[model samples]
Target: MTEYKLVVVGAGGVGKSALTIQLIQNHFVDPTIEDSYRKQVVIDGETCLLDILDTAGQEEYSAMRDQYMRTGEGFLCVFAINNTKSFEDIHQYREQIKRVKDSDDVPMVLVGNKSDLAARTVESRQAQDLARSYGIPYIETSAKTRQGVEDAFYTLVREIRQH
Candidate 1:
């Protein structure tokens, strides 16, 4: 039995905490916490805990960002589809991942969140394409609908298991 550690990160209000809350509690909540913190989550219907680190945006937490990054075993670089700025920041986010990851082939998931609000979308395919160019696995998901949320962990675990 292997343990997994997944860190969910992005700009502020990009739904990192919301995604974790939905996965752990099976529902969303109001007045959400906007800080980067770790929470243990059960993965693959097994008790093997994935320390799901709910994280804040880069600009705000410049002081201790490295510390949070150091604790993650895997990374979920999240962005809100409705917020182009959040998506654009993936360039910087990529740099952060590289600096903190223990290995060059460390597993990462590029998460495009807020699928429930596609009508307000601002992030474009070109941006996602650019992320793909950097060799990160991409996924567009919605915590509100629970879409692709399971697959996010499932795929990461499957890859980790194979490795």
Candidate 2:
């Protein structure tokens, strides 16, 4: 079986736990301070084991961020659509991964979570622009509705396979 390490990063309350739970078990999980997941999945007819690290958003855990970043094979950078500040802070996470990996060709997805929120202010076009600039794919997902959740994970898996 192919094995992959994935990390989810974002500011607090950006729905990282929700997205992770939705993808792993197809159900919404209550928000927690932090978490992680593991599952054996099939991608393109191949058996794959995924080790997903859901890093905490608290700044107190900043020292441990690099450890997770360095070990991750692919990353899902999550942000809340209703919170523009979360979107703005994504660059720091993405950049840190590159610095730790010492390569720009890392597999990653820029995920805009909470797309179901009516108060969302971050536009898809803006996210696409930022993703294009960083040479990564952008996807909008709503864990509440289960929209784009699987696609986001699958896309990153495909990227990991290619890399």
Candidate 3:
């Protein structure tokens, strides 16, 4: 068995914490500074520990961002489907991971959260195009509905094992 580190990151209020909390607790809660969760999962019939680091989405945490980036074996870069600005910041987070890891092949998933919300501004095609550019998987999730939330984590875990 192995332990894989996964970091959930995105702009403030983009539902990064919601998506993470939902995966762990099956309920949503507004997060504070930082939180961690662990789950024993089987992927491809291989048992593994999925250790998730849910990061604070604030500029004040900028000094600690590199450390977070350095420790993650896989990353879930989240953004709300209704917030286009959050979607736009995905590249910066992706680039930072590449810089910190010094590899272009970092296992990552571009997660569009808040799928249950109305008046969505970020189209699925736009996010798909961006993920295509980064050579990663794209998924849409709704914490409230628990839709695609687990799949996002599972997808990243599978990618981590593969890569």
| lDDT of predicted model 2 | 0.85
In model 3, which regions exceed 4 Å deviation? 30-32
List all candidate RMSDs to the true structure: 3.2, 1.8, 1.6
What's the lDDT for all of these models?
0.72, 0.85, 0.86
State TM-scores per candidate: 0.80, 0.92, 0.92
lDDT of 2 by residue, 139-161 (tens): 99999999999899888998898
The 10 consecutive residues of candidate 2 with the worst lDDT sum are 56-65
In terms of TM-score, how similar is model 3 to the real structure? 0.92
1-163: candidate 1 lDDT, tens digit per residue: 4567777777877888778877777897532343443345466566576667776644633647778677777777888888889888877877777677656676777888888884756555765687579676677789899998877766666556655
Number of the predicted model whose TM-score against the real structure is largest: 3
Model 2 segments beyond 4 Å from truth? Answer: 30-34
Ranking by TM-score: 3, 2, 1
Better candidate number, 1 or 3, judged by TM-score: 3
